[PDB]
Amino acid sequence: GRRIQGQRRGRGTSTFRAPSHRYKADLEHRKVEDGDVIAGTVVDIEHDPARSAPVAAVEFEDGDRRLILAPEGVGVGDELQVGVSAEIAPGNTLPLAEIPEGVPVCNVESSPGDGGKFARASGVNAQLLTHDRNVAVVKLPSGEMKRLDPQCRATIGVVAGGGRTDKPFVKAGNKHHKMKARGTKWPNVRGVAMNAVDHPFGGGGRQHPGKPKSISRNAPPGRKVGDIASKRTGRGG
Amino acid sequence: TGAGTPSQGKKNTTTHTKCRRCGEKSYHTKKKVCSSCGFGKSAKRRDYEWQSKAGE
Amino acid sequence: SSGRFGARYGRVSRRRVAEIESEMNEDHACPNCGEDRVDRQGTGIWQCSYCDYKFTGGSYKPETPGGKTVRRS
RNA sequence: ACGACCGUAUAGUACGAGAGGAACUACGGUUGGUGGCCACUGGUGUACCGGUUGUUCGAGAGAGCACGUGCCGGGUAGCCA
RNA sequence: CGAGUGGCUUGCUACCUCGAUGUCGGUUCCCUCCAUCCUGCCCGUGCAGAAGCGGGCAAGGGUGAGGUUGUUCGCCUAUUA
RNA sequence: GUCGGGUGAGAACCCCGACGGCCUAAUGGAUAAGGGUUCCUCAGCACUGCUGAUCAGCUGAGGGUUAGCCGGUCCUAAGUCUCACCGCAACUCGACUGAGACGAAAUGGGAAACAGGUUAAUAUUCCUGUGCCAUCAUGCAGUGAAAGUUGACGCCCUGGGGUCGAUCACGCCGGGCAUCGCCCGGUCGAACCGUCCAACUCCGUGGAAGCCGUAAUGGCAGGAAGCGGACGAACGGCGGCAUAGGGAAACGUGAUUCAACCUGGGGCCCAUGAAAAGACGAGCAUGAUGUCCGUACCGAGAACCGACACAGGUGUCCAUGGCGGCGAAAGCCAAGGCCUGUCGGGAGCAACCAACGUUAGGGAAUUCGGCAAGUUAGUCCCGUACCUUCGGAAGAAGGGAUGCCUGCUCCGGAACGGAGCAGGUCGCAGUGACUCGGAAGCUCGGACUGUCUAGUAACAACAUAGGUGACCGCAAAUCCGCAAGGACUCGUACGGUCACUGAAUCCUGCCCAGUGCAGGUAUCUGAACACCUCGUACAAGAGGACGAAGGACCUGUCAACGGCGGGGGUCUUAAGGUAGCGUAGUACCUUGCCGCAUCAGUAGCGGCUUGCAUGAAUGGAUUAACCAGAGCUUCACUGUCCCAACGUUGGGCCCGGUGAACUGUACAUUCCAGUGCGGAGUCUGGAGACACCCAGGGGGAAGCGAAGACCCUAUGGAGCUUUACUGCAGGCUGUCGCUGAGGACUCUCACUCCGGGAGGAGGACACCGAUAGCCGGGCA
RNA sequence: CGUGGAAGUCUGUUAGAGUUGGUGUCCUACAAUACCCUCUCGUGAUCUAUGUGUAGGGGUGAAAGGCCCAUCGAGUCCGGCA
Ligand SMILES: COC(=O)[C@@]12OC[C@]34[C@H]([C@@H](O)[C@@H]1O)[C@@]1(C)CC(=O)C(O)=C(C)[C@@H]1C[C@H]3OC(=O)[C@H](OC(=O)/C=C(\C)C(C)C)[C@@H]24
Ligand SMILES: [Cl-]
Ligand SMILES: [Cl-]
Ligand SMILES: [Cl-]
Ligand SMILES: [K+]
Ligand SMILES: [Mg+2]
Ligand SMILES: [Mg+2]
Ligand SMILES: [Mg+2]
Ligand SMILES: [Mg+2]
Ligand SMILES: [Mg+2]
Ligand SMILES: [Mg+2]
Ligand SMILES: [Mg+2]
Ligand SMILES: [Mg+2]
Ligand SMILES: [Mg+2]
Ligand SMILES: [Mg+2]
Ligand SMILES: [Mg+2]
Ligand SMILES: [Mg+2]
Ligand SMILES: [Mg+2]
Ligand SMILES: [Mg+2]
Ligand SMILES: [Mg+2]
Ligand SMILES: [Mg+2]
Ligand SMILES: [Mg+2]
Ligand SMILES: [Mg+2]
Ligand SMILES: [Mg+2]
Ligand SMILES: [Mg+2]
Ligand SMILES: [Mg+2]
Ligand SMILES: [Mg+2]
Ligand SMILES: [Mg+2]
Ligand SMILES: [Mg+2]
Ligand SMILES: [Mg+2]
Ligand SMILES: [Mg+2]
Ligand SMILES: [Mg+2]
Ligand SMILES: [Mg+2]
Ligand SMILES: [Mg+2]
Ligand SMILES: [Mg+2]
Ligand SMILES: [Mg+2]
Ligand SMILES: [Mg+2]
Ligand SMILES: [Mg+2]
Ligand SMILES: [Mg+2]
Ligand code: NA
Ligand code: NA
Ligand code: NA
Ligand code: NA
Ligand code: NA
Ligand code: NA
Ligand code: NA
Ligand code: NA
Ligand code: NA
Ligand code: NA
Ligand code: NA
Ligand code: NA
Ligand code: NA
Ligand code: NA
Ligand code: NA
Ligand code: NA
Ligand code: NA
Ligand code: NA
Ligand SMILES: [Sr+2]
Ligand SMILES: [Sr+2]
Ligand SMILES: [Sr+2]
Ligand SMILES: [Sr+2]
Ligand SMILES: [Sr+2]
Ligand SMILES: [Sr+2]
Ligand SMILES: [Sr+2]
Ligand SMILES: [Sr+2]
Ligand SMILES: [Sr+2]
Ligand SMILES: [Sr+2]
Ligand SMILES: [Sr+2]
Ligand SMILES: [Sr+2]
Ligand SMILES: [Sr+2]
Ligand SMILES: [Sr+2]
Ligand SMILES: [Sr+2]
Ligand SMILES: [Sr+2]
């Protein structure tokens, strides 16, 4: 047949790419040697085209203008501290060791000094639970207990822009606009509505899949469609 | 709209032009490559064995 | 508050937008003073017309039930 | 290039207990077809006359354009049913 | 039960056409056949009459309008000689 | 187009005048692309031109494009290339990372020019006048100098300032008309230099406890109004420019509405709306320099693309010319353009055809079907049902009004703006043309806007929001590459990948036996390496031991593929069809039966419904709104019909000129029968038949057009499917190499990743190379 | 009651986009997809110019096996090839 849509994706053509040239900043944490004497004042609160959540413009003590991931409640004029012995205030970045247990945290690092990987979407938060000299157990937004290094930096508080998923898109045009700002080809034509040549579920006199939808993990790209390695399907049982 | 006569009216783009190297009207001014001699693509001149019959 | 949607879309599509836009253009308290002058600027961006305080909050709410949990600890 | 039907007189008669109910013939009309014709009725009639909207020639008068008459009203000859 | 005629139904066959003989129904326009529905002339009757039933000669003329359905076919309505 | 005239050997179409027309977002003006000399002059008619030609985009020969300040040039955009690096058997190949370059001529950014005159042809380029910018030199000033500002920015609504234009008032200049005294044109004057400043912001004063303010939002003791002030706009006003220019002349003044331009206020986003060079910041004189490339003409029913002087296609600016009216609408008319959407002459001009007007009475009887046509129509007033998601339905439906003239009232600063009143008055008709909905009901489908088969399908198909399931913590899941590498990703579960269903509302039953996916697994089965036995002086080879994934086996799972019957008062194979819906776009029987409606209804609708073979995200039901979607009914309307007629315009017919093509074995005046490979102008027998030509509608030449798409055949082809055959990628898994120290474990030194670095995480694993087993229509 | 002016909102041959019916005209065409009337959308998932990217078992595809220069159930050219 012909290569399926998921195969055209990896080629990285214009249609499947993200409008990077229209994106503001790659939100990473500031690189401090040691100490704490790094503080800044929030100049502006901007809209980030990349994640739909707001982003805070901060100017530091050493005169560095960089955008940072905005938590809830952080406004213009406010002072945020970054360092080891930073004040345990919402919006401050300090390693997981220094942050007390049972406190909601965002922009958590994987390997210490990477700039933040986990809990970065609108209104989400990671929960810090257990402490040790070796490990800091953080409960990520998916409900998974991630065992992390205590030297991994994290910003205190939940991410701003919460409850975005609550209000519906209502009309196709609103989805259109959102998708034109992301790295996604939209709209989605069902495989079952295509020809046999185009997709494993294409063909027939009526629209139904050919074989069962639950595909094996070992399936090759071109065949791996539908329910990928499903442990189960349905709602009941 | 027909793919024939009414689609011919839009054809006012200039692509293939006289080539600096070989003199043929094959220099694609958008690709900056010559379709005849390979100017812009290769230092060597575009020649292929299929430009003639196998035993010639 | 979704009369712009007309006779289209349905109950839930205009009820969950009516409860969102009635608690958005509403008078909410400000963190710098005691004024109810908090209006929206965009997605997640809020501002008070009093002391020019431009802040961060939820997308449609200036404070989410999750943002109030941080104030505790 | 004529086909067929209805009606009147025959006759409430022949026939028949009654109920019911003919024909020959003589008439009048209708229908279908056919050929022709336009006094009459009807249609057309961008011949013609009138009314009138818009705009242009200054107004008036008198006109052009509005699809092959702007629109409305009347309509001779002829051609027609 | 037996003997046939037709070539309108269906079937059979594979002769003709696959370097193409344009489909069904309908329509329009022309000719024809008779195994006659009406009309003309007749014979019989379980022919009083009236209305019929059956049959004979006969193809001059006629055999129309509509409702459902693409329908052919058919069902249905009101007229009709 | 016509009548005159001009030139010419020759004139319907070349030129002049007159008369008559056509074009108004174009048939006018300026341009982009593209063309390429097509531009101008002179001379021509062999070619080209739908006829002719004295003409020409044709032939030939000459000539024509002038820039510091208009573009290019410079800058950076999506992105492209080059070099280096790495991959590759290799390259003219290939991703990343660096560096450099390229990348905008209408239409991104940008130092600077206006007015007039001039040519056969150029013109912000030449000439006259005036002006401006940059660099440099000198002189004076200046020590400031780089922080900041600008370049520089979305969509929607809106205020204020304001020019051109248009119109009104009045005056002057010129023209027109002549029953009036009305009508038309003009009344000019730039860049630049100087100056003025509304809005916004801010400061002083002030002292509001209810005031200030707006079209609207709004503002304030954290200091309102009022008062003074700093900052600060136009392509605008004002003055100069200008005893410049231009005009035959006059060579105006005020006003309203105000495109351009200037400057503010508000609202929206699960959408957030370039960058860089450059400029400003940061003076003035005088002098010098300001090179290079483009510059003609067309820009289209003849200069472009479409083989053509092609009814097609082709971007931008003029969107403010007048009446009209809501209007960038119609219709009419200026300025400007044109009579080249380029053959003519003749016939009351027949038939027949294309477009079209009007048709009495009837009124869908026409037809598969109201197809075609028609009806309705603008504006105001009154009035408006079922149903509904409360938005809508709705312009429902239905009724009335509508001109002109005289004199007025109201709103507003006013309009040459709007709303009304009284009286008079004309027509068949007052939205008098033009412009301008026919209306109502039942049903099916899809919710809706949207998408689609460029060229027979616009739909019920695709999309959609919404619903749902699946995979993944990021050194991820998913995907691309042979590799070096890469998309997703300036992303992180409120994410984004992979699928299904398809708004809302009410719901979504039962089945895990088969198949699929996933988890588990005592035991069984399970390859190679290493190891053990036999064998061989070695080797081939045979057997054993251990045993990964996988399988067996067990479990989970159906909004996973799918299933939901036969028999009787269980059987296959797990269950045995629940809500609903139902003769369905699904019902064979079938025009099912009853009812509605009609004279008559295989239609349509309601009910029943044992459903050949309905049914729950293979989603069931339902539904307001929407629809160039399918079906039906009513009112209205009508040449669709009864049944056709007359007319109009272009053809058709005759004449001049121009001038193809299809097709052609031959013969050929046929007709009725027959015969023949059973469908004959040509054979047989008869009949008929004097030749030629014009017009016609198409009976025949099994007419012309296409080596039939139907069907079969060929050890033909291709696309597609799968538990067809055989293989190939890919995934999983064992083993060997990299690979190191001390049947479970510790370590650090290779190697990997994170960190700028210090250093941190991981670690002999992972990656990579090799081999083995399993899965493997993803591909051949 | 007014103000406000929302909208994949309505009427609309505004510009512009599209293409339902006539199964009209044409069908050796004006035209190898044209003409006329009728019809649909017309502030948005809108339309459009120029520049730029994706390439052949590959693109692109709101999916019609649509489109990739009159060429598509695998473009075109030349070669294999007689
Ligand atoms: C121009 O067309 C023809 O001549 C055909 O003749 C009658 C016909 C055919 C053929 O004879 C022949 O090809 C049949 C008579 C042959 C036959 O056997 C059969 O069963 C049928 C159904 C034919 C009817 C008719 O069919 C056409 O498709 C067939 O038409 C076509 O095949 C094609 C046509 C009109 C063009 C598309 C080429 C007919
Ligand atoms: Cl999304
Ligand atoms: Cl230029
Ligand atoms: Cl305002
Ligand atoms: K045949
Ligand atoms: Mg980041
Ligand atoms: Mg969602
Ligand atoms: Mg996009
Ligand atoms: Mg879809
Ligand atoms: Mg399909
Ligand atoms: Mg396949
Ligand atoms: Mg389906
Ligand atoms: Mg389905
Ligand atoms: Mg024939
Ligand atoms: Mg007889
Ligand atoms: Mg006869
Ligand atoms: Mg009939
Ligand atoms: Mg000459
Ligand atoms: Mg000129
Ligand atoms: Mg021409
Ligand atoms: Mg009539
Ligand atoms: Mg119609
Ligand atoms: Mg007043
Ligand atoms: Mg039906
Ligand atoms: Mg639809
Ligand atoms: Mg099509
Ligand atoms: Mg459609
Ligand atoms: Mg969905
Ligand atoms: Mg979803
Ligand atoms: Mg659908
Ligand atoms: Mg029924
Ligand atoms: Mg179910
Ligand atoms: Mg054949
Ligand atoms: Mg076949
Ligand atoms: Mg094959
Ligand atoms: Mg790295
Ligand atoms: Mg295959
Ligand atoms: Mg493009
Ligand atoms: Mg198909
Ligand atoms: Na017989
Ligand atoms: Na037979
Ligand atoms: Na027929
Ligand atoms: Na007879
Ligand atoms: Na019938
Ligand atoms: Na001519
Ligand atoms: Na000025
Ligand atoms: Na006007
Ligand atoms: Na719409
Ligand atoms: Na099962
Ligand atoms: Na079923
Ligand atoms: Na539509
Ligand atoms: Na008529
Ligand atoms: Na004939
Ligand atoms: Na094929
Ligand atoms: Na209101
Ligand atoms: Na059309
Ligand atoms: Na190919
Ligand atoms: Sr980094
Ligand atoms: Sr990061
Ligand atoms: Sr299928
Ligand atoms: Sr269930
Ligand atoms: Sr184009
Ligand atoms: Sr190259
Ligand atoms: Sr070569
Ligand atoms: Sr009698
Ligand atoms: Sr009696
Ligand atoms: Sr006229
Ligand atoms: Sr008889
Ligand atoms: Sr009928
Ligand atoms: Sr039959
Ligand atoms: Sr029947
Ligand atoms: Sr022009
Ligand atoms: Sr001559």
Ligand SMILES: [Sr+2]
């Ligand atoms: Sr000329």
Ligand SMILES: [Sr+2]
């Ligand atoms: Sr450049």
Ligand SMILES: [Sr+2]
């Ligand atoms: Sr420019």
Ligand SMILES: [Sr+2]
């Ligand atoms: Sr715009």
Ligand SMILES: [Sr+2]
């Ligand atoms: Sr104004």
Ligand SMILES: [Sr+2]
């Ligand atoms: Sr010029």
Ligand SMILES: [Sr+2]
């Ligand atoms: Sr044109």
Ligand SMILES: [Sr+2]
């Ligand atoms: Sr066209």
Ligand SMILES: [Sr+2]
């Ligand atoms: Sr004129």
Ligand SMILES: [Sr+2]
């Ligand atoms: Sr000519």
Ligand SMILES: [Sr+2]
């Ligand atoms: Sr008349």
Ligand SMILES: [Sr+2]
């Ligand atoms: Sr009818």
Ligand SMILES: [Sr+2]
């Ligand atoms: Sr009315």
Ligand SMILES: [Sr+2]
């Ligand atoms: Sr199309």
Ligand SMILES: [Sr+2]
């Ligand atoms: Sr639903």
Ligand SMILES: [Sr+2]
């Ligand atoms: Sr199972």
